[PDB]
Write a protein that binds this ligand. Structure first.
Ligand SMILES: C[C@@H](Cc1cocn1)NC(=O)c1nn(C)c2ccccc12
Ligand SMILES: [Zn+2]
Length: 140
């Protein structure tokens, strides 16, 4: 589990969105595994605006933050899970790192701020849904 709290937005994995998220919906995209809802309180996270390929992510199944090198956001075929059939996921970045299904929502960050959240994984890989292109998260 986990979310990004920037401005009056909450960014979560679409597959982990709650009824309150759907009832306060700002934007969602199944191909990216992302959903954004509105919040009453202002958040403290800031979004990175860059093309870094090194950063650190939080792994709840180890209670640890790990440094990683990761690929650029791309269209990748992801195997089936209980939340989606096997399909192409867009804006996804891969790295070598430990992960388990409940690690989704952990933040990946670089020197500039938050880069994205854990979305996919297995066999020593972890995949992150990028948010750096969502410029509107910084205003309104
Ligand atoms: C919960 C789904 C969401 C999903 C996105 O694309 C399709 N399904 N993801 C997973 O199944 C999953 N995520 N991580 C971090 C893993 C690590 C090891 C094994 C499985 C996974
Ligand atoms: Zn950066």
């Amino acid at each position: 589990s986990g979310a990004i709290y920037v401005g009056n937005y909450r960014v979560v994995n679409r597959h982990l969105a709650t009824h309150n998220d759907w009832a306060n919906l700002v934007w969602e995209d199944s191909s990216r595994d992302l959903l954004v809802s509105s919040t009453t309180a202002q958040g403290c996270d800031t979004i990175a605006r860059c093309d870094c390929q090194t950063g650190v992510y939080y792994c709840s199944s180890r209670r640890k933050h790990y440094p990683v090198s990761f690929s650029k956001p791309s269209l990748i075929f992801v195997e089936a899970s209980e939340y989606y059939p096997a399909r192409y996921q867009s804006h996804l970045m891969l790295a070598v790192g430990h992960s388990e299904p409940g690690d989704c929502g952990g933040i990946l960050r670089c020197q500039h701020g938050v880069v994205g959240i854990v979305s996919t994984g297995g066999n020593g890989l972890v995949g992150f849904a990028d948010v750096r292109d969502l410029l509107w998260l910084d205003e309104e």
